[model samples]
Target: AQPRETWGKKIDFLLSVVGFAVDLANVWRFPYLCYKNGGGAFLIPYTLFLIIAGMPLFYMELALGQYNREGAATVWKICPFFKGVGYAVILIALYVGFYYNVIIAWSLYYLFSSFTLNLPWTDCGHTWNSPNCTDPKLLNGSVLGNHTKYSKYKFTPAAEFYERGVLHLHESSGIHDIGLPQWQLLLCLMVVVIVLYFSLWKGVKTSGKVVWITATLPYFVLFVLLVHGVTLPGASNGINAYLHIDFYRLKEATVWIDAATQIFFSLGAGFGVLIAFASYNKFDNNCYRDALLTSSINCITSFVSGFAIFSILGYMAHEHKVNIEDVATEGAGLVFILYPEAISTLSGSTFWAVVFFVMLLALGLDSSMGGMEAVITGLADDFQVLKRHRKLFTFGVTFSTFLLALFCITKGGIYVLTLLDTFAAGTSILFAVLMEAIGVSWFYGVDRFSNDIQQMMGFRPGLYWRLCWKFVSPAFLLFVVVVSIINFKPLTYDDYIFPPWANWVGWGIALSSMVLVPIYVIYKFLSTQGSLWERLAYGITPENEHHLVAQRDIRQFQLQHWLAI
Candidate 1:
């Protein structure tokens, strides 16, 4: 039998785990969601959910990984019936793996463009600019003054560049014709995938080393941007708008659901990366402290990145003579559009633009690394032969993803990208997490799990964590899931609404990840030899327990040789 590896050090493990949690969601998504949901008032519910839902799940995943010494898929050694949890995680990560690189490719393109003498998005003179495109810089001061009271909804240079120059997105309909891939983006996609392969070439050994730069360097870049952003003209307006709280928003059920969703997504709880990363830790690594420290740092980083982002947005609002609310938006627009708009107006705009996109690429790379590893390790664990050819497997996975990602680089690709972003890792993640919590807390036994922690860490988790795992966190998560369904709306980008079939396609993507649970159960029940009652009991039992009831060869099919073999 081969031995499994632990992380070289605690710091390496901590950085990897923390890096996964503090991803593009914090930099690009969280700030926008904050601006949209309840502004500053959103922090109250976000903080509450972090404590009750985020941290507890964070800790649980860490514990599960370390205690089992297994990747996410096999980690369910404690509850074989729910082993589908690991498969679901792998599928989700694969979805993210392909789409995530598309975003990085976009960042890489922007990063290369930042080296130009004049930023392409700084002026509306490009061939991509429409007849109606309004250059905010060239608008007469008097005209801007007159429109100060009215929302300046006119297209900015950045908007035109992103839609027309980059995406060529003339269609407002759903993803109908995914045109040929942009050659520039295809090359960029190749580069990012190559970089990702090298970064993760040796698995955690190389990835852990790379995290020294990827995880820590982005914060310095962020601070520099924050310093630059807040000093720009009208920066205060953006920061003020960023912090403006609406107490009335607290009354909306949607606000609470949004808060829960943010916290859930922010901490990277339900995705299984946390569990996979933590699996590299020493048994007594004191993940309790690591969990709390990393998550707290993640929240602080989210708060700090908002200042950097909104400060630029504030300047953009001032330049356009529009309210900060009018300038701020969600998803790709917030990064590829609004921030670039502000960056273009800055003196030495290219330098600042380069720094911002580099920071984004750095953040995206780190997050994607964790996700890629989760998929890699999960597959490696489940299938023994693949482990013997790890590098080949890594290259195959990357190359295939790069091939699929070409579609996302096409004209209608942004529409497809947004839909996947909305659904692939959306509310269905809560279902995975809820199942996980029930598997660990209710079925496997929370008290027993806590006692196991005590055996390793010298002290058990406090009552708060125990109770939250058993009840509070899951209760709130279910509540959020129900409300999210009740108020669910179709995906849209700016004024373009996705067609009904596109929404159905989105739901199908979500269900694809989630349906594994019952599917696996049905498969298990049919394959077993027992009567219904006996098979049902057998399914819920741990496939193997390392400590008390450890049973090797717990998987249904024995690890088999490859097709060639």
Candidate 2:
């Protein structure tokens, strides 16, 4: 019922999809996981999954979006049962977009700060906690240098059961007095909101150009940082320590699970967010090539990022004249605190700092845009007001998302990220995959789809892709998702050291992101489905094909509506 202009033009479609796949999640979040998970050993599983686990799912999403030529809400209407998964994706992505923008703002803040003579961490006086890091001894307390056993052990307090079945629990690192300033961090977030506001204000055209600057240019920034890092005295030590492997740890059940999940998370798999982006892609735009090139580039970038990150750590170790083990660590403790000091060792630290943050700002913005698009489109696909007024819809969504992100910077932001990460993993991706496979293969018809690709590309999709969507992945993902959930163990920040109340709060934040989907699916199933036999059955069956199908409806929903708040 809408004119063709309603969808994003074809040329920019690949840019948006690639932009989503290669976002801040990989840059800010992933390398830290590598450091924590067996380092070099982790890459083995990561690379393998990046191909086997990540790519095919990406292919399916692209195909569905393109084939449907409608938003996700209607795309999965082939079966009413599958519709719940689509709704789950919409809800979860919206929630995620809200908090992620805060981190996007941090990169922008650092980018602006870089123009100063000294970077924030260089002087050890810019942030309130710089004093905690000023004394060389205080800065050099990481146990990675010598300890192995206790360091790996995260401690949770003995949980207490109380009256009326209410219980309390907690955890603590037992380390004291470490955190960045609240006000400065908030100021950084303000910059993020402004950037997000303008980037999408004009819709995909503005966002597409923003990607070339924000998404692509960061590779150069990383190159500059990498060049500088490797030249520093201790950079090689950090690289060496990071690349070192225990081999035995690689064999552990936990190691493989962690590696697989990291790749899935890093590559943005199972989300079908990429597919939704690809749905806007021009029919002739070969998603196959884009998915392959992007996935490979992303994998290589992971190693590149690990080195670029640790190269700074190595140099920092050289500056502190400490072991690289002491300097290189995971998360904010190392990257935010230690690495800034490492960058200070550079003669023109501020220049390098600004350039480095410029890269981050670019990456964060690029990632944020893709995520924003998915969240907006997923919702607007149903709401008519958003579809009719695109610009206003986008601005409102961006603003609301920014407002939500502000909460991420509050006392509970870290809790939100941790919670979201824990929940959004194999659970969401795997479930999404099951639904997509059902939609595309069972509903959209994979053979005809493949034939369409063949007609367009002059080649067939081959056994590799077919096998992945059919058997190799769906089965593997089901196992992974179920195992991960049944084993969804509670996490603590430090050794069984957290207070019971704080520990409970942290777990609560994390569980909420993941539990959202099952909650939605269950509500829909009970509210709509009248039988229990329907609940026991998990995979799609021949009977489900006839029993749960629904008619496609897009008269109400449109792409432009996604811009709505």
Candidate 3:
């Protein structure tokens, strides 16, 4: 049998974990959520959920992955019945990973555009630019008296560039007329895949080194922007708007949901990347410390990026004499459109634009590597027979994903990407996460898992950690899941609506990963030996658990092994 690989060094392990956890969501999603929710008050629920749901889950995944020394799919030897949960995780990661690269392609496109003397988004004369495209420099609060209170504000050149030029987007009348690929995006998409392939071509060794740059360098870039952004004239207005606390807003359940959901998405939980990264650590490494430290830093990054983002927004709002909310957009718009617009207004527009998009690309690439690595690691584990051919496997997966992503570069690609992002990742991820909590806590036995941690970490987890993992986390997750379903709205982009059939297809995308659990259960029940009850019981208990002892140690030999290391 082949021996397993481990991270080459301790910092390699730390950077990988941190890089995997900190991604574009921190830059885009959390700040927008903070502003939209109760502002500073939203942090209360966010921190609470981070403690109860995010941290506990992070620690659990770390322990599970490190202890089992396996990827998401194979790690489920703990509870064979819930093997489907692992499968669901990989499925979610793959789906999210597919669209993730599309976003990266957009960043690549913008990054290339930033090389120009003037930012492409700074002008309104492009063929794709609409008649209503308002120059950012021209918007003034008083002069814009024609802009009405009730009506939507006219599109900024940046926004117009995103919809009309970059995306060449057609609002989906339906999914039936899937359009041809945008040649520019197609080229950008190919470049993104080439970069991604080379990044992971050597597996963890190359990626681990790459994260040293991909992960840590973005901080310096963001801090530089934050300093510049704070000095800009209207920066305070935006900061005040983002940090504006409405204590009464806490009474609303939406505030809580936003906080919880942001906490979930921001921490990069439930996606199997954490598990995959931890799987490479030495068995006795202090993953407990790693989890807490990484989670805290991830949260801080989200908070700090808000300053970097909103300062620019405040400047924009001041320039336009409009509400910060009017200038701000949610999701990809904030990252691609609004921020790009702000960059174009800065002195040395090309330089600032390049800096911003490069920072954005680095941030995005970190998460994409993590997501892709999860899928790669999972497949390698299951087909250990193909272990020596890891490079080939990586190439095959990347190439296939690149091919699949071409569809997203089409004129209507943005619409499909939006639907996939919303339903596939945004909605279904919560369900996968809820199942993971239940599977590990309830079915697999949280107490047993905690004991395993104690064996590796040299101290048992505390009451708080245990409580969060077993009861509090699940309850919190269940609440979020229920609320997400109740508040679920149909998919729409701007004014165009997904047709009824498209909506059904969206739900089907949401259900795709989740439906696998029951399907696998039925298969397991039917295929396993013995009576119905016996087979059912077999599914809950672990398989080949002793395989660990056979490979790694004697029953009580772990201590000697630890001391030797």
Candidate 4:
């Protein structure tokens, strides 16, 4: 066997991990969720989950990959039966990349548009604007006579540009009527895929270098935006709205669920990228410290980004003479529509627009590179043919993702994008991580896993990590999974409720990845040449620790093994 590749420097690995964890969700999702859940009080549940579930899982993956020196799929040699969990996460990463890169392309498009003297989304007289389109300045301090029509029919220039110009959504009714891909978006997607291919073709050696710019640029841009945002009129109002504590809101079950899911997704733990990135570390690298530093940086970035976002949102609300809630939102609308709308009102709108979209481009690119690397590394490690022909394989993966992403660039592509965003990684990823917790801490034996970490880090995990891995993390994950299913709402994009068939298709996409686990379990059982007991024992035994099965000393079936800390 060949020796594995290691990172060029420790900081290279750290930056890559931090770049992956702190993604677009940190900017778009976390701030709004913080405000909506319980404002300052939301941190109680978010921090609780981070300690009990998120950090433990994050640390576990880092140690698992560093010790094994294998990508997500092949790392499951520790317990072969759970190899499907690896496959499930890799698939989820691929599904995420399909839509995620489209968002980057949108950022790229906006960045290109920002080079103009007059920002396109600033005024009401564009070809894309409807008769009802109202410049936000006109509506200031004026109450509408017909409230319903004003609310329902009126559109801001920013919203009209997003809906009518970029998405071309007005041309298609909904998901079922999604038309052909727009040529402009198709070209932008191609450019994004090309950049991803070059950044990733040579693996970490190339990607590690790329993150030097892609990862670090966002922080610089974020600092600039934060300073400028706070100086704007009404910035303090937005900041206050963001930090306002509504302790009573914590009583809602949805608030807790929001915190759990936000932390889980924001940390980007279960997508196989963490495992893949850590696999490139030197054998004796202190991954335990890397895990803590990177995850802390990720959470802090998310928190700090709230100020940068909300301060601008506050300025917009003040300009329109409305409450912050009226302008505040999350996801694409917040960045592409609301923020751009606010920038348009500024004296130097063009420069601000350019700087802001540059940040978005950097954020999205760093994260997209991580997702694609997970797919490439996960598959290439499992198949030697791919490892030998990596550049060709990288192109194949990026091109295939680009082809699939065409579905999201259509006239009604935003509907497809929303559907993918909701279902691709939501419950499926939580379930995969739950299975991973069980596979590692339960099936593989936490005592043995702790010894592996001790070998690499020179210290055994203490009682807290042991307890969390074996008990708390799995329980937390299971609770989130159950609540996610029970509280599920029908898919809607704004006022457009998806048709039943579209929901069915969305579920099919989600379940297709999840079902790999049980199916592979059955296949492993049937393929093994042994009686039921022997098959069961062999299935759970580590490939490296096969002597246990040969010696008939299987610890997995013992009572003390299950009870051990």
Candidate 5:
């Protein structure tokens, strides 16, 4: 067999993993969640989940890929029945790219918008502004007529720019009436696709080098922003809000759920990117150290970013003479609306806008590249033809994502983006990892897995790691999955409640990736020739250990295999 390609250097692998894990969510999502879920108190559940579930899953995928030296899908040679989980994750990663690249394109558009002498979102009189548009500067924490808040009747210049100028969301009524793609966003999306294609076309050899800049630039810009943010009038208040602990909030199950979900998504586990990235490591590399170091860095980045984000939010609240709750938000509104609005009030606003969007672009690009790499590596390793023509295959993958992403740039694209974001990876990813944990620990056998890791690193995993692999991690996944389903809500974006059919469509999108597990299992069972028991035994037995099947001594068939740690 041809020797598989390896990382050009150890730091390349570290950078790629760090780049992939510390993504747009670190800046936008986590800080807000920390504040809303009881501030510093939220870290208790988050840290607990991280120790019990998140780090173990992170370490597991790295070890699995590094040991197998195979991409996500093909790495399932140890147990053929679970290969569909590989496909499920690859599909999930691809589905994520469908909308994720559009987000990067939005940042790119914002970066370009920052070049003007005047930041476009600073004032209220642009053509995109509606009659309701209100300069936030005009408000002085006073209610308008009829005893209503000014925020209720007015839209900020920054919010108008994001909703109307960039997205043109006002043009479409809802998701059902999503209009044609805007030409500017289309162009921006194209540029994003072209950048991703080039960065990823040659596989890790190229992407690894590209990440050195894309991954590291965000940290530098974040530090700069944090320094500037803390110097502002209300910065301390915002940081205080971020760190204030409310222990009573922990009594709510949702707090724990939020922490668990954040841990999984924040680490970017179950996406197959970790598996694909680690597959390129040199044998005997200390992946245990890599896993612990990179994951800690990713978590720390999220925490530090909270300080940067809330300080600016505090300043915004001070500028408006309102509570921080009035100015605080999450997701696109926080980054595209609130942050831009905050930056517009500062001296050299244009310079601040430029660097801020540049930071967003960097954060988004590297993460998008990781998702694309997962899809590319997963499919290519499963199909030899694609591997032989990697460049063309990479183009094909990126181009397809770009084409699909066009829908997300339409007039009502934000609605579509929200739907995809909610369904495409939310529970489906948890389900994927749940299946993955079971497949690796239960079907593949923990002892056999430990032996594989030992072959690579010369030390077996301890009982803690083995127990997490077999029980704790899967239970953690199962609890989250069940709660997610139990707490399901119909999709909504702002004021527009999605129709029932849209929820069905959302679930269908979710199931499209998830159903592959059972589908592949049935297909594997039907295609393998033998009595039912023999086929069952053969299905769980690794190809390398098939002689045990023929000899009728397959350990997996015995109760001891199931009972053993």
Candidate 6:
């Protein structure tokens, strides 16, 4: 097979894929989840899933993409049924990317905002009645702290100042999370839209190139921040708290589940990005080795970042005279509200402040790129459209996704973020992953698939991975489904069972996307009008395969060839 198109070069492609795989979740969420669950103890099950849940699904995606040479949607075009599943997943990805970019907005806002070090109310300058004002001088240990587990892990200055006695809120703790003043927030939203618009306009080709910066720069910034953070007074205490796991906490089923999810979260597995990356290889990329190394590297890097975060949290906790848990949390809000405040109080605060936010921005942009383009490239290859105006067509999809993203930056921006973060990113990935596994493992046949990997890696994976694929991975996925369903909270308060009009509007917004995927596929299959399943399953019929092949009006057949991916 010819090599897949290269944006810069093979190394660029490889690095970008890996960078995307090692994304926002690793830096912001992974450590917090682990810390909340049991820190080091979490690694036990996490490492287990790295192979079981993460790697195999990744292999399947790459294999599928390579086979189809098209977008995830058209990959199975030979068969009307499964050909559409990839697009179904793509729709999910697009919807996720739309609102998910709002998350990147937070990172972007924080990184730039961090430069201020001392923001509008760093000194709490506003009057009591002036758009939710407060004073930082009133903050004390009793008031400001990280949001506890199961609470929304958000930080706002008014809440922080009031918590630590530097300032006071007009209301109780309920006064937490007053976003930028309505007008100010609107301006911020416009700035965010512009950034997103520019980044995504040229599609994956442009974003693909940008990944070199967004994806790679974060690590460098993080390295600098880590060095500075550790040298800060009281930083070690935060690091120690994470390393010292409570054995008793391990008993809670939810804690273990959190650990497992963190493992999935950290690896960025089950997202199909790895698969799409692998598909780009010229059948010699040794993705099996890549998968192992990538997962290992992601873990080590995340742990390093975790300590860097905790170290900074240590300084914040010490100044506020609060416990470290009160300063650190699983959400990116730590970067936005809490950490920036800490940076403001630091010696040479601007220096450290700029460093932290830039790191966050890079981390965010990199993670988003792979997800945005994974399906685009996969679909283009699947449909053989790359043979046409591949770049333009791919760019179109990305631009459309960005346009959808613009809506998220509205006044409803936070609302969009809250709902998107809920299930569309991690949990949605989990759902698609489970479906993909069933399609490949049970329907596609395990032995045949393993043989391809064995050939590619030069050595077969051990029985552990096999047993995991056979049972463990799916079981864990099902467990996540059960847990997510049992805890079926909507992204918007309006989405709940209460206010009639609000509930209707919320459900419409939420369900609108949930239904778009299947409908899109149905439309595609209907349009193709004549593709057949038998042509997909059996390929050229055994009878006509050798003598008079006419499926594509070509001769020379290859048995067991994956049907257009």
lDDT, residue 459, candidate 5: 87
Best by lDDT: 5
Q: List the residue pairs that clash in candidate 1.
A: 545-550
> Which lDDT tens digits does candidate 5 get at residues 96-199?
88899989999999988988766677775673444344343433335432233323423667777788888887789998899899999999999999989989
Worst 10 residues of 6 by lDDT: 166-175
lDDT (tens digit, per residue) of candidate 2 on 1-565: 4642333454466556566666655655567667666777767776776678777877766766665555665556444446556666665666666656665665565555557664444333423122322232323334324333211311101001010001001221221222332455566766776776677765466777777666567777788788877777877877877787755666677766766766766677656467457656666667677777778777777778887887776776565555655444554333434444555656877777677667766766777777767766666666766767777887777667766666555533555455554555335556666655655554444465677677556677887787677667767677777877688565555333334554455445435534654665566556644345444232222233434323322211333322211
Candidate 2: residue 470 Cα off by (Å): 1.9
lDDT of 1 at 117: 78
The C-alpha stretches of model 3 lying farther than 4 A from their native spots are: 127-142, 146-155, 170-174, 545-565
Between prediction 3 and prediction 6, the one with superior lDDT is 3
User: Where is model 5 more than 4 Å wrong at Cα?
Assistant: 127-154
lDDT of 4 at 414: 86
Q: What Cα-based lDDT does every candidate model obtain?
A: 0.77, 0.58, 0.77, 0.83, 0.84, 0.58
Q: Which stretches of candidate 6 lie over 4 Å from their true place?
A: 1-4, 7-9, 77-80, 111-118, 126-131, 134-138, 141-209, 382-387, 390-395, 454-457, 490-565
Query: Tens digits of per-residue lDDT for model 3 on 1-565?
Result: 6688777787987887787777777788788889888788888877887877567788899899988888888888867777777888887888887788899888888887777775667765663454343454333423664355311344556666677667776443446676777788889888878877888888678887888887768888889899898889988988998999877778887787877777787787776888888888888888778889988888888889888888988887776667877776667776776776667667888777877788778877878888888888887787786567887888888888887788766777777787888788866788888888888887767677878998888998887887788788888888888887888888776667877787788788777777787788788888987676456556766676544432443322234422221
Q: Which run of 10 residues does model 2 get worst, by summed lDDT?
A: 156-165
Q: TM-score of predicted model 2? A: 0.77
Model 1, range 284-380, lDDT digits (tens) per residue?
Answer: 8887788899889999999998888888878877887777776666676667876776676778887888888888888888888888888888888
| True-structure RMSD, every candidate | 6.0, 9.1, 5.2, 2.2, 2.1, 6.4
Q: Global lDDT for candidate 2?
A: 0.58
Query: Roughly what TM-score does model 4 have, to 2 decimal places?
Result: 0.96
Model 5, residue pairs in steric clash = none
Worst 10 residues of 5 by lDDT: 145-154
